[PDB]
Amino acid sequence: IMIDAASSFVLPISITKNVDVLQRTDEILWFRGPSVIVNERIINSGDPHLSLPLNRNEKESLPGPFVLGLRPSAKFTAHRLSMLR
Amino acid sequence: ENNGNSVKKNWSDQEMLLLLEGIEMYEDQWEKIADHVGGHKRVEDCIEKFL
Amino acid sequence: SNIPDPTLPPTEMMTRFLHPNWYALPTTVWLKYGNYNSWAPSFNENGTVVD
Amino acid sequence: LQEQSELMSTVMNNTPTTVAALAAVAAASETNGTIPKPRSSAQLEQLLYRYRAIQNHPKENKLEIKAIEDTFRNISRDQDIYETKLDTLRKSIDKGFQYDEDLLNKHLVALQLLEKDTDVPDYFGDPDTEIRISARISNRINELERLPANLGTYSLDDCLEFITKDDLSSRMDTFKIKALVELKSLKLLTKQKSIRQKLINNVASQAHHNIPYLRDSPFTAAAQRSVQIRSKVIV
């Protein structure tokens, strides 16, 4: 198991004409491995569909992942904006 | 964070964490311990805070 | 690291202190010559503090 | 022999019907020393509910079902007695007392500190007692070495930051740092004692060259003068 590997490669031909959305050096960084997509960094460990209680085949499509993201209500945000000035 | 901190002898959680990280790294050579906090803390002051 | 666990049997932290107000000072040394010597200089002092 | 933990292991192993702890006269009576009346809220009561719901099918191979039903009758009787006492308590309330605020502030701080086993003030050598200190230090060490590493925070001030689906706000690790500063300060406790022994035995070993009232003493000045006497030569 090695730690001090390079894991970064840049092609010498500069085709930096229409490339401004990627991660530039400031050239294009090319890794040895792909990227990973994480939807929400917070996990609601309640919400008993995930915790599976032992009391009582059912399908249910919940609206959006934001149930599992601890999203606050807009009234507290409006109250904090009223407390801002 | 990487920006400059507040006035000295405040000792926030980053400055308290990095010193205890560096002591577990080197255990001596306080010149190599003061710069692990970020360099803005003195060698004579980090010892007084750790004691 | 190489630090020991804090549930170690040496933890007294004060066993060889020997504070300088507890130092023994050189005082006058009484000498004995025999059983029938009552005119000799009895005790001796060289660098003594007290009488 | 951990009769309350064997049912939890059988529920976690998803095989509580093939053996069901083999409750007999030599097995169900050896681990119990009638179930011993567990005191948990729902962590050991739902296991008894599942243990009753599974064994409804054999219906004769287990003889402790009568003891479990008597325990459930006792639980229902205690619930009814608690509801009647709650009704009597809510009907026995006086109209006016005018309870003060300072005594409430004195009770809440003390009741909060007595939850998690820490010291609270009143405001109303010796190796036998050092092992008791080390056993409380190692208790907090073994408690802090059981926390999950994937600990994140959420304060009530993040609504001014407008966290999107991929935002990575800078107030996520405000408690993970403080959960490691304590864990690594309880380990460097013997590390700082060596620095303190090297400091105190160098600032206090002399104690008569920087302190003025100890070097201005008639005994100390005469002693420091008399220890530097050079020996006299002969002829």
Method by which the model was determined: cryo-EM
Nearest to D5 by CA among D36, A46, D63: D36
Q: A28 to each of A4, A7, A34, C42, C48, how far by Cα in Å?
A: 21, 13, 14, 100, 86
Q: Tokens 């681990």 belong to which residue?
A: D31
Contact between chain B and chain A (3 or more Cβ pairs less than 8 Å apart): no
Q: Which residues of B touch C3 (CB under 8 A)?
A: 24, 27
- Separation CA D175–CA D182 (nearest Å): 11
By C-alpha distance, the chain D residue nearest C21 is D207
Inter-chain CB proximity C3 and D206 less than 8 Å: no
If DSSP codes are grouped into helix, strand and coil, which group holds residue C17?
coil
**Which residues are paired to C30 by β-bridges?**
C43
Geometric angle at alpha carbon D58, from D75 and D23, rounded to 5°: 65
Q: Are D3 and D27 in contact (CB under 8 A)?
A: no
Q: Are A27 and D154 in contact (CB under 8 A)?
A: no
Inter-chain CB proximity B17 and D196 less than 8 Å: no
Q: D146 to each of A36, D139, D149, D151, how far by Cα in Å?
A: 29, 11, 9, 12
Burial class (CB in 10 A: 0-12, 13-18, 19+), D78: exposed
Inter-chain CB proximity D222 and C49 less than 8 Å: yes
Q: Which residues of D touch C16 (CB under 8 A)?
A: 201
If DSSP codes are grouped into helix, strand and coil, which group holds residue A28?
strand
Give the N- to C-terminal CA distance of chain A in Å, as an integer.
56
Q: Show which residues on chain B lie within 8 Å of chain C, measured between beta carbons.
A: 24, 27
Nearest CA distance, D138 vs chain A (angstrom): 30
For D38-47, which contacts have Cβ atoms below 8 Å and span 24 or more sequence positions? D38/D4, D44/D4, D44/D8, D46/A53, D46/A54, D46/A55, D47/D4, D47/D7, D47/D8, D47/D11
**H helices within chain C, ranges in order?**
none
Nearest CA distance, C42 vs chain D (angstrom): 22
> Encoding tokens for residue D3?
């009769």
Contact between chain C and chain B (3 or more Cβ pairs less than 8 Å apart): yes
Q: Are D221 and D213 in contact (CB under 8 A)?
A: no
Give the N- to C-terminal CA distance of chain C in Å, as an integer.
57
Q: D220 to each of A53, A78, B30, D214, D230, how far by Cα in Å?
A: 79, 75, 37, 7, 19
Between B13, B23, B47, which is nearest D191 by CB?
A: B23
Q: Are A72 and D162 in contact (CB under 8 A)?
A: no
Q: What DSSP state is assigned to residue A9?
A: B
- Separation CA C40–CA C44 (nearest Å): 11
> Encoding tokens for residue D226?
């008399």
Inter-chain CB proximity B50 and D181 less than 8 Å: no
Q: What are the φ/ψ torsions at residue D233 (nearest 5 degrees)?
A: -80, 160
Give the N- to C-terminal CA distance of chain B in Å, as an integer.
25
For residue D3, count other CB atoms closer than 10 A to its CB: 19
Q: Are A69 and A40 in contact (CB under 8 A)?
A: yes
**Which residues are paired to A9 by β-bridges?**
A30
Inter-chain CB proximity A42 and D152 less than 8 Å: yes
Q: Are D222 and C49 in contact (CB under 8 A)?
A: yes
Inter-chain CB proximity D154 and A77 less than 8 Å: no
Nearest CA distance, C35 vs chain D (angstrom): 31
CA torsion sign for A7, A13, A19, A20 is: positive
> Encoding tokens for residue D51?
């243990």
User: Chain D within 8 Å of A15 (Cβ-Cβ)?
Assistant: no
Angle, helix D178-185 to helix D131-144, in steps of 10 degrees: 150
Q: How many CA atoms lie within 13 A of A28 on its CB side?
A: 13
Q: B1 to each of B14, B15, C18, D100, D173, how far by Cα in Å?
A: 8, 11, 48, 46, 12
Nearest CA distance, C1 vs chain B (angstrom): 6
Q: Tokens 């409430």 belong to which residue?
A: D104
Nearest to D156 by CA among D177, D178, D171, D176: D171
> Encoding tokens for residue C16?
């060889």
Inter-chain CB proximity D154 and A80 less than 8 Å: no
Resolution in A: 7.1
DSSP class per residue in chain D:
--HHHHHHHHHHTT--SSSGGG-STTTTTTTT--------SSTTTHHHHHHHHHTTTT-SS-STHHHHHHHHHHHHHHHHHHHHHHHHHHHS--S-----SHHHHHHHHHHHHTTTT---------TTTTHHHHHHHHHHHHHHTTS-S------TTGGGT---SS---S-S-TTTTHHHHHHHHTTTHHHHHHHHHHHHHHHSSS-SSS-HHHHS-HHHHHHHHHTTPPPPP--
Q: What DSSP state is assigned to residue C30?
A: E
Angle, helix B13-26 to helix D178-185, in steps of 10 degrees: 40
Beta strands (DSSP E) in chain C are 29-30, 43-44
- Separation CA A26–CA D192 (nearest Å): 45
Nearest to D166 by CA among A39, B1, A42: A39
User: Cα-atom radius of gyration of chain A, to the nearest Å?
Assistant: 23
CA D224 to chain centre: 55
Q: Write b or e for each residue in D203-220: b if 16 or more Cβ atoms lie within 10 A of its Cβ, otherwise e.
A: eeeeebeeeeeeeeeeeb
By C-alpha distance, the chain C residue nearest D138 is C7
By C-alpha distance, the chain A residue nearest D54 is A54
CA C1 to chain centre: 41
- Separation CA A44–CA A50 (nearest Å): 9
CA torsion sign for A84, B2, B8, B9 is: positive
User: Chain B within 8 Å of D9 (Cβ-Cβ)?
Assistant: no
Nearest to D23 by CA among D183, A82, A6, D54: D54
